[PDB]
PDB file of C-alpha atoms and ligand atoms in Angstrom:
ATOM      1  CA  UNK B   1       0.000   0.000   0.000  1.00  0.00           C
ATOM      2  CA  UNK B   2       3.207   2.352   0.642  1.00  0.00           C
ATOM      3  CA  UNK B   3       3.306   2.263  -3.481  1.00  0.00           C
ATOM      4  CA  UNK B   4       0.007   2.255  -3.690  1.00  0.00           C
ATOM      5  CA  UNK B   5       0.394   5.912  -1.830  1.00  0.00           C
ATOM      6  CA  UNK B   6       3.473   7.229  -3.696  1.00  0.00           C
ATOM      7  CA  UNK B   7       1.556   7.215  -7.110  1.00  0.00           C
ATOM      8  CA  UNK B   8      -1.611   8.687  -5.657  1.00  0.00           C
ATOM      9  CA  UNK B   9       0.648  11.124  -4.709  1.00  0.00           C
ATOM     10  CA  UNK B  10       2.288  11.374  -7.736  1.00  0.00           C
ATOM     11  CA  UNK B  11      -1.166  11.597  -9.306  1.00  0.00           C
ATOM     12  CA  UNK B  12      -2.739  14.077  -7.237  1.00  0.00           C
ATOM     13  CA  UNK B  13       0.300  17.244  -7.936  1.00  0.00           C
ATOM     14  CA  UNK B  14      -0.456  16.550 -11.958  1.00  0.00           C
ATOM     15  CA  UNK B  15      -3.104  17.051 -14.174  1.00  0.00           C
ATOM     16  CA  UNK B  16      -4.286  15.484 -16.836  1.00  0.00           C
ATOM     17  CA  UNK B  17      -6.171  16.570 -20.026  1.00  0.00           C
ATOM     18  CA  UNK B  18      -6.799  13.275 -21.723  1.00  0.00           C
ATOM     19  CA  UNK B  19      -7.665  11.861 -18.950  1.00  0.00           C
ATOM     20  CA  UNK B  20      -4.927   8.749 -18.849  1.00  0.00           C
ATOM     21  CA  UNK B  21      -4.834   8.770 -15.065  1.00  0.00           C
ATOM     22  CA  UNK B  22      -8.906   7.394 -13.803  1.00  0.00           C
ATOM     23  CA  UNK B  23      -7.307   4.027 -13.480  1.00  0.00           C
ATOM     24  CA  UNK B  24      -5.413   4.842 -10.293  1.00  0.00           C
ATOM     25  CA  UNK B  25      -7.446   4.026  -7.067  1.00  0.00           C
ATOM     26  CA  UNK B  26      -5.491   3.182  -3.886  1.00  0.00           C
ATOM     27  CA  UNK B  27      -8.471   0.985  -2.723  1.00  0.00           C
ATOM     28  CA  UNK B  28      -6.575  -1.992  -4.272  1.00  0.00           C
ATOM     29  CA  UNK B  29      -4.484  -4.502  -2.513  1.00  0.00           C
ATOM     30  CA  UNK B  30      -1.511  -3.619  -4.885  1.00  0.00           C
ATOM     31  CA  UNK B  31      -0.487  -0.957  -7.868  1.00  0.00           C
ATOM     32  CA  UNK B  32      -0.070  -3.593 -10.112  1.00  0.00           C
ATOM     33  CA  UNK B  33      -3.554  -3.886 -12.396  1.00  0.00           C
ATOM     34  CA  UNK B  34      -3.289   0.482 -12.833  1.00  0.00           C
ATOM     35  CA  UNK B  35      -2.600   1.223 -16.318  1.00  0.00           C
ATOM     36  CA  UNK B  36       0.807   2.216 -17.710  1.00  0.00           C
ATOM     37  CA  UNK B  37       2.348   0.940 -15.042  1.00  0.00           C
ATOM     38  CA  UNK B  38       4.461  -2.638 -15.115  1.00  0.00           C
ATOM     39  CA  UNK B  39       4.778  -4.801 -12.733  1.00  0.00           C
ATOM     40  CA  UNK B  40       6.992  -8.213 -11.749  1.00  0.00           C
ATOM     41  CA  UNK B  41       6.294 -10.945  -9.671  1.00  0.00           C
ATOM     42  CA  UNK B  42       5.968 -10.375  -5.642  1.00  0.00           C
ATOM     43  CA  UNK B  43       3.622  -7.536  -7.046  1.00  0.00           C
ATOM     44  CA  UNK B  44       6.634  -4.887  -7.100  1.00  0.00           C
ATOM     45  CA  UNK B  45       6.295  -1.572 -10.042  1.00  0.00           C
ATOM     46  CA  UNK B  46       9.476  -2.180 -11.828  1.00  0.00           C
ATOM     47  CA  UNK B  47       8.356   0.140 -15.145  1.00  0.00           C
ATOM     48  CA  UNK B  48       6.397   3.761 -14.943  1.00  0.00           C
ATOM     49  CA  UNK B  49       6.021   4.621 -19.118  1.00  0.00           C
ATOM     50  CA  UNK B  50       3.996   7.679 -19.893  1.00  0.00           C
ATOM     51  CA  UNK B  51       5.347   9.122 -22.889  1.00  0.00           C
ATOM     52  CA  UNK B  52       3.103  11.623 -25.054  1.00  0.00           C
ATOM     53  CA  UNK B  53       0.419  11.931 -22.470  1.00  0.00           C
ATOM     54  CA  UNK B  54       0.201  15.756 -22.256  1.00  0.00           C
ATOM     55  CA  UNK B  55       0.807  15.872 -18.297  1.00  0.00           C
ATOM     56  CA  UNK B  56       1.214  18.981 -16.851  1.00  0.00           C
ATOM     57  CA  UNK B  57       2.408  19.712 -13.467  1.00  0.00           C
ATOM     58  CA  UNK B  58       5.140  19.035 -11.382  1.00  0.00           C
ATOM     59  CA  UNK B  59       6.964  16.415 -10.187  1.00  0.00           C
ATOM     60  CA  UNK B  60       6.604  15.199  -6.733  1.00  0.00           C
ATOM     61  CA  UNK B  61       9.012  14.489  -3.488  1.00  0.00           C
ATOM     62  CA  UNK B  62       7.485  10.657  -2.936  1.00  0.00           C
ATOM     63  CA  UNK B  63       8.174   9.341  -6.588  1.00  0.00           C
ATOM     64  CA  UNK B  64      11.445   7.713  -4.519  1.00  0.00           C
ATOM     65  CA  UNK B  65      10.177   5.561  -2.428  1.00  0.00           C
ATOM     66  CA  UNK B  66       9.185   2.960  -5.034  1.00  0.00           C
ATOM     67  CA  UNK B  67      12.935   0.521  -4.489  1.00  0.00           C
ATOM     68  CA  UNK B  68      12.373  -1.738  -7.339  1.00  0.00           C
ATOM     69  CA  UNK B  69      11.801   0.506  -9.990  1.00  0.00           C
ATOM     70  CA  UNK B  70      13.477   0.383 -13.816  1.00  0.00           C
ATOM     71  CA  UNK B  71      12.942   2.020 -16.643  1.00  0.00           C
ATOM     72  CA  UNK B  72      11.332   5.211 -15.700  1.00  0.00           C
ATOM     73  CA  UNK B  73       9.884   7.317 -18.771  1.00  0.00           C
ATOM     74  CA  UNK B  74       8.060  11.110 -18.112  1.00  0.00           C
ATOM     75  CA  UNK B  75       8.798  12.604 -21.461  1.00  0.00           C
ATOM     76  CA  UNK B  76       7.465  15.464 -24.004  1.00  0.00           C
ATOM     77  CA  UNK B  77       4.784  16.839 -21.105  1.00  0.00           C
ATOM     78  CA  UNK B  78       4.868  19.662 -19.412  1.00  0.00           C
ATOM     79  CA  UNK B  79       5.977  18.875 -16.324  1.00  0.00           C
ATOM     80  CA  UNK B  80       7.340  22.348 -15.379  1.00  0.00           C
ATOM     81  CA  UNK B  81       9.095  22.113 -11.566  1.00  0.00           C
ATOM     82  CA  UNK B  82      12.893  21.015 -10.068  1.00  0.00           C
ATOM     83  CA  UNK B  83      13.986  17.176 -10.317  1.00  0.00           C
ATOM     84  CA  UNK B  84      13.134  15.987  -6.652  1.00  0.00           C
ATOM     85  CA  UNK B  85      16.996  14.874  -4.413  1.00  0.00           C
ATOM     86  CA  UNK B  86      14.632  11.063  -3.989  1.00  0.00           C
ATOM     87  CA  UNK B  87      15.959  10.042  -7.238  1.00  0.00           C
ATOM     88  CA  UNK B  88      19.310   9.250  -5.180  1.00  0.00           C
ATOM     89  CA  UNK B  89      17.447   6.355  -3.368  1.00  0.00           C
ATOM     90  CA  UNK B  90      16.319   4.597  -6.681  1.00  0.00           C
ATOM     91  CA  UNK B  91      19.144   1.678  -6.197  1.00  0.00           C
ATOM     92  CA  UNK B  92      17.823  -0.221  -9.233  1.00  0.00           C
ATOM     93  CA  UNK B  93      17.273   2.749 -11.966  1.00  0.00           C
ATOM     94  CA  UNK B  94      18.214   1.990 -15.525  1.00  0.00           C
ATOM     95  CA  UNK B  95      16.920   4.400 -17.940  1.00  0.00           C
ATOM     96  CA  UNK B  96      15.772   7.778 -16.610  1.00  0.00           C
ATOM     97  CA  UNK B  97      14.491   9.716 -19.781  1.00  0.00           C
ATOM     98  CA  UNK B  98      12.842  13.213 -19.204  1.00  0.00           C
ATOM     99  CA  UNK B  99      12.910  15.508 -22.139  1.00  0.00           C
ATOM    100  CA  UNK B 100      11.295  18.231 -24.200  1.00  0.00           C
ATOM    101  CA  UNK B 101       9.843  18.818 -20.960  1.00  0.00           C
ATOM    102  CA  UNK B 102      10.121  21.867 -18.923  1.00  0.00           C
ATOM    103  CA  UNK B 103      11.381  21.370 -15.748  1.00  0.00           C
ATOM    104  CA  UNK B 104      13.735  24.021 -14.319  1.00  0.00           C
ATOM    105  CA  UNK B 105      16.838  23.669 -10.742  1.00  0.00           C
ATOM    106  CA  UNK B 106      20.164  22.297 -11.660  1.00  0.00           C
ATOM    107  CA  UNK B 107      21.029  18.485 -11.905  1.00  0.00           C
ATOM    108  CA  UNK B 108      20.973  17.178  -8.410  1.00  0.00           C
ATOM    109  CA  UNK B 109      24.591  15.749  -7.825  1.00  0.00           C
ATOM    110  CA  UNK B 110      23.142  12.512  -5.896  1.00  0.00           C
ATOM    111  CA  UNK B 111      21.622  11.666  -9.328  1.00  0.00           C
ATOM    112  CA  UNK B 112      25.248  10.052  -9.638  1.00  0.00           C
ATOM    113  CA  UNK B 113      24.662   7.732  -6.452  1.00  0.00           C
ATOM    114  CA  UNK B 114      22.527   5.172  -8.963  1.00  0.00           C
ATOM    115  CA  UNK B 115      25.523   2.881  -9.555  1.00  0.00           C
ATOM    116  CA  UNK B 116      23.665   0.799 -12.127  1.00  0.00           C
ATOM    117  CA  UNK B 117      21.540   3.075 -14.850  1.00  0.00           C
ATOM    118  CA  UNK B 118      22.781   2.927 -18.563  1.00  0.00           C
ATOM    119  CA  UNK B 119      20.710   5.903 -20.298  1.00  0.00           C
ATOM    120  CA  UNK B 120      19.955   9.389 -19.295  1.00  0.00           C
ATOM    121  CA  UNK B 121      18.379  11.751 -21.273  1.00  0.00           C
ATOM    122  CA  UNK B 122      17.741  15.319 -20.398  1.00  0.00           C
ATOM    123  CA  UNK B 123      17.150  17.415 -23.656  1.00  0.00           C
ATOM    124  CA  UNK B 124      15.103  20.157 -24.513  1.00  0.00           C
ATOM    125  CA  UNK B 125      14.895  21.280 -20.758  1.00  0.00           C
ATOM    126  CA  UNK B 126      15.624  24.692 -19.093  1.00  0.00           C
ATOM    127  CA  UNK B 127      17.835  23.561 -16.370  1.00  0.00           C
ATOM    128  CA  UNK B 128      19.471  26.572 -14.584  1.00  0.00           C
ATOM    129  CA  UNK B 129      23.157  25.172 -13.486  1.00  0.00           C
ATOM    130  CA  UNK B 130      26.234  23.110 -14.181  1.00  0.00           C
ATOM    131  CA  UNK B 131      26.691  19.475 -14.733  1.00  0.00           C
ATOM    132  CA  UNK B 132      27.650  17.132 -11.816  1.00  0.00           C
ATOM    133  CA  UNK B 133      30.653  15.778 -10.912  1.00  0.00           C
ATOM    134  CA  UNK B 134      29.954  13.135  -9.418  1.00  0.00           C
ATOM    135  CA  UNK B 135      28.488  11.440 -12.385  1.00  0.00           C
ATOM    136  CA  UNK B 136      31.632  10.626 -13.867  1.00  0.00           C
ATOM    137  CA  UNK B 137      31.611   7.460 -10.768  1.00  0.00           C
ATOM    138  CA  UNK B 138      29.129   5.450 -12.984  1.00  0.00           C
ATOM    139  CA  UNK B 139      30.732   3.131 -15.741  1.00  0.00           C
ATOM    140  CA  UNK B 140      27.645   1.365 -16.743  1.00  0.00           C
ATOM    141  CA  UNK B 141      26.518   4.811 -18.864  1.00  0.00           C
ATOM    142  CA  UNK B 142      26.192   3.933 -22.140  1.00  0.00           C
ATOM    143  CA  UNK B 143      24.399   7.034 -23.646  1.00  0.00           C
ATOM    144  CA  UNK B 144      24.421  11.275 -22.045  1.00  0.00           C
ATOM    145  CA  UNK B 145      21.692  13.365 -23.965  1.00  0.00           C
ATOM    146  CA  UNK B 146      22.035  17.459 -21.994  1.00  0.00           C
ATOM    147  CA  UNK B 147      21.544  18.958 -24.606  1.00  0.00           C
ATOM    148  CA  UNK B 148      19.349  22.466 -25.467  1.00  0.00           C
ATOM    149  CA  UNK B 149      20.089  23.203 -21.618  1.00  0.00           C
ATOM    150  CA  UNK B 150      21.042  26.563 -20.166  1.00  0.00           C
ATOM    151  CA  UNK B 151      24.101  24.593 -19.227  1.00  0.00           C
ATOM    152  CA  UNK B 152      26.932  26.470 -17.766  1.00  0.00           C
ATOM    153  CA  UNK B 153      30.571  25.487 -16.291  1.00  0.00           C
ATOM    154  CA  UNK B 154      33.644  23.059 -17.156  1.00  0.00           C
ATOM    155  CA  UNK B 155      32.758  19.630 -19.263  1.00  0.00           C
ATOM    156  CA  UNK B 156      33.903  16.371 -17.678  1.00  0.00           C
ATOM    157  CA  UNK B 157      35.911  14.152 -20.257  1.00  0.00           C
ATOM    158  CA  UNK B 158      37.484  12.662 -17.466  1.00  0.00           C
ATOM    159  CA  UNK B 159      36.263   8.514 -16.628  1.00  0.00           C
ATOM    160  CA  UNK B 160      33.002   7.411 -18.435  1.00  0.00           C
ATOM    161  CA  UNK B 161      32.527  10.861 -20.059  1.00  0.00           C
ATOM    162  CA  UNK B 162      35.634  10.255 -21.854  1.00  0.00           C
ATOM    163  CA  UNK B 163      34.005   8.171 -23.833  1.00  0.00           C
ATOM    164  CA  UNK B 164      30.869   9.771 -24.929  1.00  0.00           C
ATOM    165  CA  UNK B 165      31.551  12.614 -28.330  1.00  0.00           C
ATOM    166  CA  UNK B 166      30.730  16.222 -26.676  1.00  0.00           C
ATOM    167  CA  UNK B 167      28.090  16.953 -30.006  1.00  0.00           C
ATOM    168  CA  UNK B 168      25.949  15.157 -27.254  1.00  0.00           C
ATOM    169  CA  UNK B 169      25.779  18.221 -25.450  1.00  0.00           C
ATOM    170  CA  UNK B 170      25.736  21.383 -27.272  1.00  0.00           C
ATOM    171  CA  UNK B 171      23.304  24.459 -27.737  1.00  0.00           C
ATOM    172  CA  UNK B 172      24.378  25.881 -23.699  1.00  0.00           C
ATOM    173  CA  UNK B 173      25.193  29.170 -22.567  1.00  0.00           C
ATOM    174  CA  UNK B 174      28.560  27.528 -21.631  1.00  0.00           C
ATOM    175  CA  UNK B 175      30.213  25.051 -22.978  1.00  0.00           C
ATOM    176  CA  UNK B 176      33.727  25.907 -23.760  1.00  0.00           C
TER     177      UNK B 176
HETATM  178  C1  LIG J 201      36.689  13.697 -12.922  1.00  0.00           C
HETATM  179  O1  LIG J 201      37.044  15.062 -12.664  1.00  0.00           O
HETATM  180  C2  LIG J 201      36.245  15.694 -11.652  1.00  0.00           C
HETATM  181  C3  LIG J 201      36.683  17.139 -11.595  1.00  0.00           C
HETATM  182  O2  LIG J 201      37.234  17.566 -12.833  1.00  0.00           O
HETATM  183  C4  LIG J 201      36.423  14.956 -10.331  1.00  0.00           C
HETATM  184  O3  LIG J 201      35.616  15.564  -9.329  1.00  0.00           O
HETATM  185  C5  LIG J 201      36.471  15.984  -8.245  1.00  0.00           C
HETATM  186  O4  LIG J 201      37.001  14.860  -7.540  1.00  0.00           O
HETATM  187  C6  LIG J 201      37.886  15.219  -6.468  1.00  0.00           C
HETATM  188  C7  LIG J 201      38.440  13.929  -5.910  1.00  0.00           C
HETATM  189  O5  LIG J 201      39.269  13.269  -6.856  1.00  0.00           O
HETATM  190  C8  LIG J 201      37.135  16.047  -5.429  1.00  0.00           C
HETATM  191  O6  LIG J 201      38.057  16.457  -4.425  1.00  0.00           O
HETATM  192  C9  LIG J 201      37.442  16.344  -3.127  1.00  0.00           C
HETATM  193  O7  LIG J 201      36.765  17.551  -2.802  1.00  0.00           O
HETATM  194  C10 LIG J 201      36.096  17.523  -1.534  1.00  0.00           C
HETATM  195  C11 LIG J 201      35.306  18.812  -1.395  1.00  0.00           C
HETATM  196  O8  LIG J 201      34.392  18.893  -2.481  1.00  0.00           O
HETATM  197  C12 LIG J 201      37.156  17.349  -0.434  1.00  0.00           C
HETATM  198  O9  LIG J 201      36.521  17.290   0.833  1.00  0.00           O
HETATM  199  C13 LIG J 201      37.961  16.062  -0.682  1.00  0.00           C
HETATM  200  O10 LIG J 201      38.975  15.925   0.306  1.00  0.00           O
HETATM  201  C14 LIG J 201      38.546  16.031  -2.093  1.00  0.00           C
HETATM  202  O11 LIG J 201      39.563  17.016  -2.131  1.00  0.00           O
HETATM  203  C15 LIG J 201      36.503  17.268  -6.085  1.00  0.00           C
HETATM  204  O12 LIG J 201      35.683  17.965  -5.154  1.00  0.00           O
HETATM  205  C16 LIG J 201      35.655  16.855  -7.286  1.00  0.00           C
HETATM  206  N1  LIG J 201      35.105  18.024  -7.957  1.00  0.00           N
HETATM  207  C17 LIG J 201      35.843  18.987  -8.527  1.00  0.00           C
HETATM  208  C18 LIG J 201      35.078  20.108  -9.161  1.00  0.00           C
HETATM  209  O13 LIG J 201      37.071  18.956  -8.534  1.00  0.00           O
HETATM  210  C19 LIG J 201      36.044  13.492 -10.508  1.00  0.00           C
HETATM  211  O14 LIG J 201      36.283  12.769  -9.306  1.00  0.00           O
HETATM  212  C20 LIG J 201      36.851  12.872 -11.645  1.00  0.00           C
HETATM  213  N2  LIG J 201      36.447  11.492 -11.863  1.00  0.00           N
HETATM  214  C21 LIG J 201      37.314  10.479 -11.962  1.00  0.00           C
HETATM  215  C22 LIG J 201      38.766  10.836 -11.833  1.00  0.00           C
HETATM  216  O15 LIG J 201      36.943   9.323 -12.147  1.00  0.00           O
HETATM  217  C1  NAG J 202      -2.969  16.259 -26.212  1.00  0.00           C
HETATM  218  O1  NAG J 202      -1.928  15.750 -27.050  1.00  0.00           O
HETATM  219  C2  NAG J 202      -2.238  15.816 -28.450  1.00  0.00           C
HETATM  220  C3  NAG J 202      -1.095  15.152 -29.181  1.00  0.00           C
HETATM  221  O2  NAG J 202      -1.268  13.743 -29.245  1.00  0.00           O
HETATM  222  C4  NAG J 202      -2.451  17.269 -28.866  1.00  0.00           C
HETATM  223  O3  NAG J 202      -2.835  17.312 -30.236  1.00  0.00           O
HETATM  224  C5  NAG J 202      -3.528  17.914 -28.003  1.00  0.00           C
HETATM  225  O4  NAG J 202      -3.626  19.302 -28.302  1.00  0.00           O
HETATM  226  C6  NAG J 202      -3.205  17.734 -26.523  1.00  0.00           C
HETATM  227  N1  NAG J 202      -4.272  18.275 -25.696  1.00  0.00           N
HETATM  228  C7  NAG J 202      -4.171  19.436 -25.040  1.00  0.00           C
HETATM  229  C8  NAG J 202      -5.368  19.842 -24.236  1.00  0.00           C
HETATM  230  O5  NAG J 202      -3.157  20.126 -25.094  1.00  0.00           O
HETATM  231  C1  NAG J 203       1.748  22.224 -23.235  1.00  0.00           C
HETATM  232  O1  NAG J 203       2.702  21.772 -24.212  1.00  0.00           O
HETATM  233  C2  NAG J 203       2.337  22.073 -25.567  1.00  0.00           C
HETATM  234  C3  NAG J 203       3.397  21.459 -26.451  1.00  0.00           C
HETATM  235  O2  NAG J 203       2.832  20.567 -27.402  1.00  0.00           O
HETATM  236  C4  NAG J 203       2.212  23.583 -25.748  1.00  0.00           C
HETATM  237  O3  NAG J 203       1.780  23.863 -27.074  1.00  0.00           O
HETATM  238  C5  NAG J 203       1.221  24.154 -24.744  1.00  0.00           C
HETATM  239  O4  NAG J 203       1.197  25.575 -24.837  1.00  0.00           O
HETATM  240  C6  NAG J 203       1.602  23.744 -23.325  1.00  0.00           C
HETATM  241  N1  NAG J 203       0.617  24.231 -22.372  1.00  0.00           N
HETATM  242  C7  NAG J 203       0.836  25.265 -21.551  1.00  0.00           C
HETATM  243  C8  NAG J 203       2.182  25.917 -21.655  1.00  0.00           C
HETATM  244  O5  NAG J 203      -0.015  25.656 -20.757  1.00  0.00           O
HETATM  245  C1  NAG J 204      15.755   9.220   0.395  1.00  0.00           C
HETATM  246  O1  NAG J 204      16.474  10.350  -0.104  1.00  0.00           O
HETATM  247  C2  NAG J 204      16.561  11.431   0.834  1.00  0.00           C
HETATM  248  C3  NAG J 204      17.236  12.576   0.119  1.00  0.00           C
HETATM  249  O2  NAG J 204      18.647  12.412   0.090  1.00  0.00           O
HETATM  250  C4  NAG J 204      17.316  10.972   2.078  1.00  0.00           C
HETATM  251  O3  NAG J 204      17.340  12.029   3.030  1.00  0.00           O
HETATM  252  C5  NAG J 204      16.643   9.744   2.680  1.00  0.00           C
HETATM  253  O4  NAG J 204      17.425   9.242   3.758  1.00  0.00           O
HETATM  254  C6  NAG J 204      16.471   8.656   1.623  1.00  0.00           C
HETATM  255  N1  NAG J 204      15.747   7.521   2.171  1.00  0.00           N
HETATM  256  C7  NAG J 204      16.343   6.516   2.821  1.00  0.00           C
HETATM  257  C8  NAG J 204      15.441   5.429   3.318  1.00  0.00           C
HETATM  258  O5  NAG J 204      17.556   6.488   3.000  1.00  0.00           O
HETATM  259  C1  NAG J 205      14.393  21.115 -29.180  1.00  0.00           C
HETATM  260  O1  NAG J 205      13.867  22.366 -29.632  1.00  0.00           O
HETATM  261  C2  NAG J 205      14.303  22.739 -30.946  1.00  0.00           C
HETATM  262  C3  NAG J 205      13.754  24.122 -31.212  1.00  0.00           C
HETATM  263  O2  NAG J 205      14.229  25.060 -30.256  1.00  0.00           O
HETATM  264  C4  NAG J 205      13.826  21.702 -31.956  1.00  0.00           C
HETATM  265  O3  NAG J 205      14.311  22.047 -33.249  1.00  0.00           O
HETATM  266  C5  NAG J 205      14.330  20.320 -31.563  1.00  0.00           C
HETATM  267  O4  NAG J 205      13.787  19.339 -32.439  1.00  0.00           O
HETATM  268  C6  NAG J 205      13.940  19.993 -30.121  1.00  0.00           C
HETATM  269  N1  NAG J 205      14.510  18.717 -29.718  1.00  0.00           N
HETATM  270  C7  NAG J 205      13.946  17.539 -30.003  1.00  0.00           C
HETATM  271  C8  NAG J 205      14.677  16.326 -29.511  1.00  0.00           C
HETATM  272  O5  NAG J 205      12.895  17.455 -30.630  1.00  0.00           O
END
């Protein structure tokens, strides 16, 4: 039921004009029959896909309590707010995609605690600082999308962001 809470949450602070969140009561036993949301076995959310859904709102402090969850997908809505610091405790993220949204803070630097996550993607946003340093820890990275940011400060090509071409990132008010 603690799940069952943290997406009621989630779904009360947004609003929705087609109407693609009715399915979400918390009178259930368990999150797992709501729609667009996947589950695994022991009844656990392990996938939250809304993709074109035309959400507006902003995003909410109790989206990290959910431990099992993968594959986390909030793009082109407009989410307008500041990425919440309970990413951090999301020990089992792999893709975090959130862009041609509008969502607006700088990249919280415990974003780099997830030790296992292989895509990011954060384009199209208007994010007002510089990039962390402590994602460079992370060697599982596979593909960095900051791109059409008002990104500002020193690049990392140091560790994993050696390895990823810097035309990923481009269109900032610094880049140098
Ligand atoms: C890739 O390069 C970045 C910076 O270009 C590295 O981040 C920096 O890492 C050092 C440690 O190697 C940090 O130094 C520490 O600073 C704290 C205070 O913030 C201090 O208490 C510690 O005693 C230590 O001196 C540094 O802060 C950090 N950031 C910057 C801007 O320098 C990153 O570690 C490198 N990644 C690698 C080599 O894999
Ligand atoms: C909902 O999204 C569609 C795109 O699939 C768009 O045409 C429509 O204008 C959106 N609705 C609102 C109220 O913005
Ligand atoms: C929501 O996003 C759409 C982008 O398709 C935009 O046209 C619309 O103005 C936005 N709604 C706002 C800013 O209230
Ligand atoms: C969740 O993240 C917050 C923000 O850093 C942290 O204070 C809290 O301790 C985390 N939860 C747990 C159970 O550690
Ligand atoms: C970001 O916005 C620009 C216009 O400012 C647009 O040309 C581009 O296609 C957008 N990015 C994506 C991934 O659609």
């Amino acid at each position: 039921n603690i799940e069952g809470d943290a997406l009621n949450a989630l779904k009360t602070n947004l609003a929705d004009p087609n109407n693609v969140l009715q399915s979400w009561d918390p009178t259930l036993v368990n999150p797992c029959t709501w729609f667009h949301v996947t589950c695994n076995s022991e009844n656990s959310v392990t996938r939250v896909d809304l993709g074109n859904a035309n959400l507006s709102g902003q995003l909410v402090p109790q989206l990290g309590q959910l431990p099992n969850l993968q594959y986390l997908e909030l793009y082109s809505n407009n989410i307008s707010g500041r990425i919440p610091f309970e990413l951090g405790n999301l020990t089992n993220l792999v893709s975090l995609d959130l862009y041609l949204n509008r969502l607006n803070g700088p990249i919280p630097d415990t974003l780099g605690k997830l030790q296992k996550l292989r895509f990011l993607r954060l384009n199209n946003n208007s994010l007002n600082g510089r990039i962390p340093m402590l994602l460079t820890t992370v060697i599982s990275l596979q593909v960095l999308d900051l791109s059409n940011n008002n990104l500002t400060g020193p690049v990392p090509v140091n560790g994993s962001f050696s390895l990823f071409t810097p035309i990923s990132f481009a269109n900032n008010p610094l880049d140098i």
